[PDB]
Design a protein around this ligand. Structure first.
Ligand SMILES: OCc1cccc(Cl)c1Cl
Length: 408
């Protein structure tokens, strides 16, 4: 039993629907209309400057990406002058937008492991309410509630939880617009809401998307969109990550940092993309990632409870023939690690991931049984696994992880 052969080639590139570790938020402290919130977030920033391309899209029409962003600013400037901010803004159907809206092996790069690491971290803000998890009709039993409270306290601030609510919000807004403005190039703010450690509600703007025409007769029909996302990441440090994007420099931002106050350039990551009804419906269900990882944690708690003939919830979560430690260093880190895996499975869903998960599972049980009991042939299963290792960053990372497991 050898390691999986990972593919040779240029490094894999980002393919998520929105930025993850590289996102940047413009934020207001709240006292519910997306466009109004977006404009108020825009107003908090004074470092805008004339935009230019700093990392061109190698296959796209870069002037059109630039034109599209300048059109967003100009049309928000229009809204500023009208007396009442409208509920929604439909973009002029300009040549640049008509183009942008449509009217090979890759090797493992280090950035996806870094994304996963960032997804497991805690943030300074809470992204869910105390009763966010579950959809029970009846009141829950005392133990079930205890497990939920413990788990929630461990993941409410997790970056992966921000990715969930960000994903829920933008898929809801796009699925709604695809239906409520079928023929419009509607401008759609990318928003999230969170609560600071001190209890203050804040509203965040990540950027914008503009949807194309969306006559979605069935679940697989595709609506195209153009995404425009703030970032402080200079794309020239890892240009292979940004193969699908045109990247603009659009401002300069004053920051507090470990070296004192600094001025940093602000970037806008622009790409054309698409999604479908069925993917948007799954996007709206990403809170189930919280439920799934809770259930893995509970699994787990039961195993310990069955052996000790006593419920082990408190002992498990408070870390009080029994386990002497936690490999990740804390129970919190186990919860956030399981959540991040579930969230990345959703952010990077693919058929290659489905086959890899099902096929690598069979090889794992086989290798375990062999390791356990030693001091019909595997070639067919290895080809089944390795046929999924093409170019997808998340699948390749999981293959790399799988190979460490084979080694030890
Ligand atoms: O307030 C939104 C907006 C529209 C047009 C130009 C600029 Cl610089 C801004 Cl902040």
């Amino acid at each position: 039993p050898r390691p999986l052969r990972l593919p040779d080639g240029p490094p894999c590139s980002q393919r998520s629907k929105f930025l993850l570790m590289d996102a940047l938020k413009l934020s207001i402290e709240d006292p519910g209309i997306p466009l109004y919130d977006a404009i108020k977030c825009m107003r908090t920033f004074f470092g805008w400057k004339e935009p230019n391309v700093v990392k061109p899209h190698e296959k796209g029409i870069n002037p059109n990406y630039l034109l599209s962003w300048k059109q967003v600013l100009a049309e928000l400037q229009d809204i500023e002058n009208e007396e009442k901010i409208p509920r929604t803004k439909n973009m002029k159907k300009t040549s640049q937008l008509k183009w942008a809206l449509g009217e090979e092996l890759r090797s493992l790069a280090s950035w996806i492991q870094n994304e996963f690491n960032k997804a497991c971290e805690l943030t300074d803000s809470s992204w869910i309410e105390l009763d966010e998890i579950g959809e029970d009709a009846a009141p829950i039993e005392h133990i079930a509630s205890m497990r939920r409270n413990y788990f929630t306290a461990e993941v409410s601030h997790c970056r992966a939880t921000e990715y969930i609510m960000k994903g829920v919000y933008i898929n809801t807004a796009l699925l709604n617009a695809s239906c409520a403005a079928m023929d419009d190039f509607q401008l759609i703010p990318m928003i999230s809401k969170c609560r600071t450690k001190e209890g203050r509600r804040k509203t965040n703007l990540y950027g914008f998307i503009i949807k194309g025409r969306s006559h979605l007769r069935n679940d697989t029909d595709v609506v195209n969109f153009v995404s425009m996302e703030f970032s402080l990441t200079d794309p020239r440090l890892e240009p292979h990550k940004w193969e699908k994007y045109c990247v603009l420099e659009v401002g300069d931002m004053l920051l507090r940092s470990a070296i004192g106050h600094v001025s940093r350039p602000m970037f806008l990551y622009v790409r054309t993309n698409g999604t479908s009804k069925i993917k948007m419906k799954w996007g709206m269900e990403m809170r189930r990632c919280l439920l799934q990882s809770l259930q893995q944690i509970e699994s787990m708690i039961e195993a310990e409870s069955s052996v000790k003939e006593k419920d082990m919830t408190k002992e498990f979560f408070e870390n009080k023939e029994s386990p002497k430690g936690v490999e990740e260093g804390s129970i919190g880190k186990v919860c956030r690690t399981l959540l991040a895996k579930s969230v990345f499975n959703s952010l990077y869903a693919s058929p290659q991931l489905e086959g890899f998960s099902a096929e690598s599972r069979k090889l794992l049980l086989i290798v375990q049984a062999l390791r356990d009991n030693l001091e019909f042939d595997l070639g067919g299963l290895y080809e089944a696994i390795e046929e999924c290792l093409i170019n997808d960053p998340w699948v390749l990372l999981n293959a790399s992880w799988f190979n460490s497991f084979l080694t030890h």
